[PDB]
Design a protein around this ligand. Structure first.
Ligand SMILES: C[C@H](N)C(=O)N[C@@H](C)P(=O)(O)O
Length: 485
C-alpha cells in the first residue's frame, strides 16, 4: 500500500475542466464500457427470441426474459468478486485493464457469426469483465484527489454523468443499428465502442493516472496465497465433474441464491460477536428498508426486460408515419434521470427541514413503482385488444423515475447509517445486494407474464409494492429515529 499523498502527487491535478486530465481517461473509459453494455443489452433480448430467419436465435420469450433478469444479478454480484480481486491481488488499475479485455472479448463472440453457445460464452466473459472493471474504475478516480481536495465530489459527479450518458445514447445507436439493419452489427458497434475505452485507458494511463491503482492495497499473506489458490483449484475440479443441468436449472439456482444470500448476510451480522446491542437493533431496522429496495428494483429492472417485450409485442410502434424501434424505449430511463435529477435536488433544498426522512423516501419510491405498473396495465385493460399507445409506456417509465430519484440517492446512506462498524466495508455490497436479489426474483416471475393474465401480472406486483409502501410509511417514524445521523 502507498499513502494517498504520494499517489495524488503523481497525478496531474490540472487538465480536464478544472480537474485532473486523468478524469478524462476515467470518464470516457467508463462511458464507452457503459455504452457497449447498455447498447448490447438494448437488443439482446430481441436477438434471443426473434426467429432465426429474422436474424434472431429463436428461443422461447420466457426463457429469453429469464436470462436477461439473471444477467443483471450476475453482473451486480460480480463486482463484489472483482472488488476483492483488485483490492487483494490486482490493484484497481490492473483489474480495470483485465476486465476491459474480457468484456471486449465477450462482445466479439456475439458480433461474429454464432448461435446460443456464443451467447452463453459472451455472457460469462462480460459478467466477469464488468465485475473487474465497473467497481474499480470509480475507485481510481478517488486516487486522483488529495486529502482535502474540495473538487472530489464534482469529479465524481462528472464520472457518474458518463453512466447515464451511455445509457441514453447506446440504444439510439446500437438499437437503431442492430434492429433495423443487422443484429450482429449492433453487437459489433458495442465491441468497437468498448475497444475505444480500452485504447483510451491503456494509452493515457501512464501520463494521466501515474501511481493511481497500480498498487495492491491489501495483499495476501504468504500462507493466504496458498489457501486461496487451493480453493480456486479445488473448486475448478469440483465444478468440472458436476458439469460432466439445464439453463433453467442455473436460473433456479441463481433465483434461490438471490434469497439465501441476503438471509445469510443478516444472520451473520446480527449474530456477530464484534457488534454491540445497539448495532444489532439497527440491523433489524434495516430489514424493511432492504425489502423495500428489492421490491422497487424488481419493478425498476423489469423495464429492461418485461417492458422491453411489451414495447415489442403490445405497443403501437407506427406513429405519425415513422416506425419506432422497440429498443429505443430503453433510452427513456436515463433521459428522465438526467432531466429530473437537478429538479429533485433543488426540491430537497427548498424543503430543508420539512423534507421527508430517508425511510419516508423509500416508501415514496415504492408508491411510484407500484403506481407505474398500475398505469401500465390500464390501456391494455380499457382497449378490447391490439396495440396500445406508446404514451402509456412512456408515462410508465416517467413515474418509475420519480420513485428512483427518491429512493436511490439515499440508498447507500441508509445502509451506512445502519450497518455495524465491523461491517463498514461490506456496506456498498449490501446496497448492491438488494438490486441483484430483485433480479434473481424477477426471473422466477417471468413465467407469469402472458398476454392473458397481463393485468393480473402488473396489478399483483404493483399492488404489492403499494401495500408495502404504505406499511413502510407507518414504521418510517421509528426507523428514522434509530438512524445514526
Ligand atoms: C439503462 C438505465 N439507464 C440504467 O442504467 N439502469 C440501471 C438500473 P442498470 O445498469 O443496473 O441496468
Amino acid at each position: 500500500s502507498i499513502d494517498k499523498q504520494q499517489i495524488a502527487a503523481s497525478v496531474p491535478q490540472r487538465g480536464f475542466f478544472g480537474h485532473p486530465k486523468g478524469l478524462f481517461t476515467l470518464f470516457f473509459t467508463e462511458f464507452w464500457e457503459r455504452f457497449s453494455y447498455y447498447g448490447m443489452r438494448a437488443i439482446l433480448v430481441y436477438y434471443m427470441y426473434y426467429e432465426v430467419s429474422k436474424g434472431g436465435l429463436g428461443l422461447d420469450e420466457h426463457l429469453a426474459l429469464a436470462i436477461m433478469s439473471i444477467y443483471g444479478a450476475l453482473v451486480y454480484m460480480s463486482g463484489i468478486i472483482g472488488g476483492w480481486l483488485a483490492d487483494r491481488v490486482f490493484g484497481t488499475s490492473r483489474a480495470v485493464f483485465y476486465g476491459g479485455l474480457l468484456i471486449m472479448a465477450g462482445h466479439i463472440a456475439l458480433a461474429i457469426p454464432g448461435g446460443v453457445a456464443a451467447l452463453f460464452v459472451s455472457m460469462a466473459l462480460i459478467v466477469l469483465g464488468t465485475g473487474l472493471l465497473k467497481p474499480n474504475v470509480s475507485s481510481i478516480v478517488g486516487d486522483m484527489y488529495k486529502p482535502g481536495d474540495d473538487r472530489r465530489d464534482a469529479g465524481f459527479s462528472i464520472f457518474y454523468m458518463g453512466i447515464n450518458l451511455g445509457a441514453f445514447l447506446a440504444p439510439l445507436v446500437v438499437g437503431t443499428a442492430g434492429m433495423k439493419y443487422n443484429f450482429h452489427l449492433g453487437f459489433g458497434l458495442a465491441a468497437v465502442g468498448m475497444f475505444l475505452g480500452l485504447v483510451v485507458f491503456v494509452a493515457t494511463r501512464k501520463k494521466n493516472l501515474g501511481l493511481a491503482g497500480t498498487y495492491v492495497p491489501n495483499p495476501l499473506t504468504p500462507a493466504e496465497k496458498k489457501k486461496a489458490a487451493a480453493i480456486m483449484a479445488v473448486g475448478a475440479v469440483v465444478i468440472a465433474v458436476l458439469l460432466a443441468f439445464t439453463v433453467e436449472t442455473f436460473i433456479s439456482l441463481v433465483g434461490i441464491l438471490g434469497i439465501i444470500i441476503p438471509i445469510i448476510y443478516f444472520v451473520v451480522m446480527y449474530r456477530s460477536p464484534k457488534t454491540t446491542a445497539e448495532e444489532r437493533s439497527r440491523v433489524i431496522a434495516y430489514i424493511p428498508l432492504f425489502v423495500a429496495s428489492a421490491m422497487f428494483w424488481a419493478i425498476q429492472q423489469q423495464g429492461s426486460t418485461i417492458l422491453a417485450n411489451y414495447a415489442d409485442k403490445r405497443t403501437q410502434l407506427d406513429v405519425a408515419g415513422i416506425h419506432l424501434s422497440p429498443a429505443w424505449f430503453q433510452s427513456l430511463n436515463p433521459l428522465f434521470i438526467i432531466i429530473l435529477a437537478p429538479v429533485f435536488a433543488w426540491m430537497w433544498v427548498k424543503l430543508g427541514k420539512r423534507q421527508p426522512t430517508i425511510p419516508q423516501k423509500f416508501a415514496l419510491g415504492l408508491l411510484f413503482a407500484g403506481l407505474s405498473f398500475i398505469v401500465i396495465l390500464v390501456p391494455g385493460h380499457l382497449s378490447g385488444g391490439g396495440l396500445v399507445h406508446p404514451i402509456w409506456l412512456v408515462l410508465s417509465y416517467f413515474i418509475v423515475v420519480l420513485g428512483e430519484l427518491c429512493l436511490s440517492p439515499v440508498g447507500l446512506s441508509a445502509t451506512t447509517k445502519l450497518a455495524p462498524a465491523a461491517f463498514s466495508a461490506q456496506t456498498m455490497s449490501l446496497w448492491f445486494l438488494s438490486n441483484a436479489a430483485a433480479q434473481a426474483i424477477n426471473a422466477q416471475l417471468v413465467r407469469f407474464y402472458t398476454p392473458e393474465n397481463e393485468t393480473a401480472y402488473f396489478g399483483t406486483i404493483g399492488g404489492a409494492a403499494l401495500v408495502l409502501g404504505l406499511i413502510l410509511l407507518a414504521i418510517a417514524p421509528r426507523i428514522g429515529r434509530l438512524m445514526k445521523g
